[PDB]
């Protein structure tokens, strides 16, 4: 309370207000702008510039008197001129995209500015921009069940995928988050509060395909035990994933096998070693990461991240920190090669996607942030601002607002680094892929920040320099050739919508959602064709689910609508959903006649599933996600949004294996029925 304060907020990009659920503004108090202000840290031309190639980019300098300047390519050509203090000067034409760095010098002194040129538009296949009506499968990687697996759905898994999902016609494989998780506490499975979103998860390396588990001796003893192979068959013919029991068989035979493969003076080691390099630190201090992890829950299991380690192993510059790294430096290696192992099966998938010419082929998913005790938090601690949580105001849905537990990147960090983080982050997740999800890519322009321990009502919308952030993420995708789908759920400003449609963004439509006030659905070809639509997502009801009520009926028994009055319409809003979609489905012809019109005498028939995924396939987004789930007719979801222990999450497995559901007459129809939907969609 004084324009101090105010002023202050704003120069760090605190917005002063915002719409809360009853559509009215809602200012922001001076406790929460203090709070986010100390969560947050603490020249001739810019630290950093970014322009759009074939346009005019001028320079602006500062200071007194004349500079000599240079600008250098990232191909090596360098361009040369000079410049007087308080005038501007245009940078070489036709400067080629990419990242390039200019230096003035006036006597001795230098300043840098890292000068990035990026394409308007992201990267875009051929197939659309020929106008192609795609479809893909969107999984759950740890649900797929097959017959070599080991309990968990993996690599392997997702090779054999691919084969039968290119031979129906379709285009990509997508998946949930695999950013790297915790091998030390498994039981922490949440795709979204990750280690680091630059490493993946070990549990997805398919251990069948690792040579050295194969050639390793006393590899092949332990598994022809009775006890191993009974483990084995327990944890494949469970109907949830056991995370413990798949990461000790994991962790065990590869342990093995590592013994093995470290003695090899070969190719195989070279390459190894030849990665271990090219990733430089940030690999290093998560192989660190989880061998020390791996130390301290020996100790105690309760030790979930660095923040609950002794004082000594919290700073990494430590001196106890740099000798427990030279100690264990066969740990460190194992964690290493567990990242090669994972990058390189991986890759494997992504060269069988190319060898079918799937367009797509393999579609990652970015998640929103790390989690505050990770590795990625734990080796660059400035860049993340530890007193704040990334969540979401309380809105009409959600009159609390939620936390996701998650410390938001400090924008000006960001910045100050030239936007390394998240070139760096965009490099390590659009590789050996075709496409990637940002999740809530409203986070280029804004997130919420909640100070730490308080409730999300008392946060705050902290601004990130998107015009930026789209150019370089524009770039990144044009030089990976993976385009780019953002997620963009909820509420949009115009403006950004613009502007993530001008950036060539796909956009994200849940069938679910796409109806009016009157719950009037959107006509298939009324939807967006810069978009993917899918008819749920792993945080909604699958179709059975959804047409059962099942997510309304199984979350009260859970605790999460305690409010009677609130819960009956929610139901009544169902039921009026469910008539405006089937009135859809018959008048845009997914239904035949003989087909029932009246909603609430209907229970979920093959008829009716395939109906409400021809409405999509018929739409004209240009991508269509479809659930394994919806294809085997399954009711239970696979998480649920405000739960932990009180449901299984990330547990849910498929219903059939790989196997038996492409031998199925039924999934088979279905899918050749909907490959020629998309190619009927025009
Ligand atoms: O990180 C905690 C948070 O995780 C999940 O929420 C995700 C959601 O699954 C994503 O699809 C996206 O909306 O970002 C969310 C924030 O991470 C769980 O669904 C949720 O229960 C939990 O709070």
């Given at each position: ?12 990009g ?52 004349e ?53 308007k ?32 759905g993996?690599?392997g ?7 039968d ?6 285009s ?6 695999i ?18 979103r ?22 092949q ?8 192979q009974?483990t ?71 030790r979930?991240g ?14 106890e ?8 430096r ?33 579609y ?6 790390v ?7 734990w ?20 009159p ?25 982050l ?21 997130l ?5 321990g ?66 009037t ?10 978009s993917?639509?899918?008819a749920?997502?792993?945080d909604?009801?699958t ?6 009520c099942?997510?309304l ?46 909603a ?19 739409s ?63």
């Open positions: 309370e004084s324009k101090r304060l105010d002023n202050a907020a704003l120069a760090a605190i917005s002063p207000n915002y719409i809360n659920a009853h559509g009215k503004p809602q200012s922001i108090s001076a406790e929460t702008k203090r709070r986010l202000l100390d969560a947050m840290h603490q020249t001739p031309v810019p630290n950093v510039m970014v322009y759009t190639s074939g346009k005019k980019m001028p320079m602006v300098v500062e200071g007194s008197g500079y000599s300047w240079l600008l250098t390519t990232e191909e090596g050509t360098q361009y040369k001129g000079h410049v007087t203090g308080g005038k501007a000067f245009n940078l070489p034409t036709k400067l080629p995209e990419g990242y390039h760095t200019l230096t003035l010098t006036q006597d001795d002194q230098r300043a840098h500015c890292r000068v990035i040129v990026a394409p538009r992201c990267y875009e296949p051929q197939a659309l921009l020929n106008k192609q009506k795609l479809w893909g499968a969107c999984v759950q990687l740890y649900t797929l069940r097959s017959e070599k697996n080991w309990g968990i993996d690599f898994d997702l090779k054999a995928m691919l084969v999902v290119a031979k129906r016609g379709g990509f494989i997508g998946l949930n988050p950013h790297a998780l915790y091998p030390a506490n498994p039981e922490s499975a949440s795709p979204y509060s990750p280690s680091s630059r490493w993946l998860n070990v549990i997805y390396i398919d251990v069948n395909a690792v040579e050295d588990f194969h050639l390793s001796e006393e590899a003893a332990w598994w022809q035990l009775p006890t191993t009974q084995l068959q327990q944890a494949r013919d469970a109907d949830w994933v056991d995370y413990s029991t798949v990461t000790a068989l994991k962790m065990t035979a590869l342990r093995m096998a590592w013994k093995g493969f470290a003695q090899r003076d070969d190719e195989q080691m070279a390459a190894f070693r030849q990665f271990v390099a090219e990733q430089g630190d940030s690999l290093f201090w998560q192989a660190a990461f989880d061998a020390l992890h791996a130390q301290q829950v020996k100790e105690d299991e309760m979930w660095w923040p609950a380690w002794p004082e000594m192993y919290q700073n990494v510059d430590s001196p920190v740099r000798q427990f790294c030279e100690e264990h066969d740990d460190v290696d194992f964690y290493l090669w567990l990242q090669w192992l994972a990058y390189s099966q991986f890759a494997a998938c992504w060269e069988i996607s190319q060898g079918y010419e799937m367009p797509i082929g393999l990652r998913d970015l998640a929103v942030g989690a505050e005790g990770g590795a990625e938090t080796c660059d601690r400035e860049l993340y601002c530890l007193k704040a949580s990334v969540g979401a105001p309380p809105d009409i849905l959600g609390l607002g939620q936390n996701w537990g998650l410390p938001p990147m400090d924008p000006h960090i960001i910045t100050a680094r030239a936007y390394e983080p998240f070139i760096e965009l490099r390590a997740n659009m590789q050996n892929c075709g496409a990637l999800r940002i999740d809530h890519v409203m986070s280029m322009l804004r919420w920040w909640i100070p730490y308080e409730t999300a009502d008392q946060g705050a919308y902290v601004h990130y320099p998107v015009d930026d952030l789209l150019s370089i993420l524009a770039l990144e995708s044009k030089r990976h050739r993976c385009m780019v789908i953002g997620e963009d759920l909820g509420t949009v400003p115009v403006e950004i919508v613009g502007k993530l449609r001008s950036s060539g963004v796909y956009s994200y439509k849940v069938l679910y959602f796409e109806n009016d006030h009157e719950k659905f959107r006509a298939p070809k009324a939807y967006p064709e810069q993917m639509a899918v749920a997502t792993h909604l009801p179709l059975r689910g959804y047409w059962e099942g997510d009926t199984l979350g009260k028994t859970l605790g999460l609508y305690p409010d009677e009055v609130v819960l009956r319409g929610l139901y009544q809003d169902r039921e009026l959903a469910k008539q405006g979609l089937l009135d859809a489905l018959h008048k845009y012809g997914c239904l035949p006649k003989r087909a029932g019109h009246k609430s005498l209907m229970s979920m028939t093959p008829t009716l599933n395939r109906g409400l995924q021809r409405y999509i396939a018929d004209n987004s240009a991508l269509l996600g479809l659930q394994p789930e919806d294809w085997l007719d399954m009711a239970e979801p696979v998480n649920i949004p405000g739960t932990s222990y009180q449901y299984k999450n990330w547990r849910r497995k498929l219903s059939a294996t790989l196997e038996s559901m492409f031998a199925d007459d039924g999934v088979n129809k279905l899918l050749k029925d909907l490959d020629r939907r998309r190619r009927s969609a025009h």
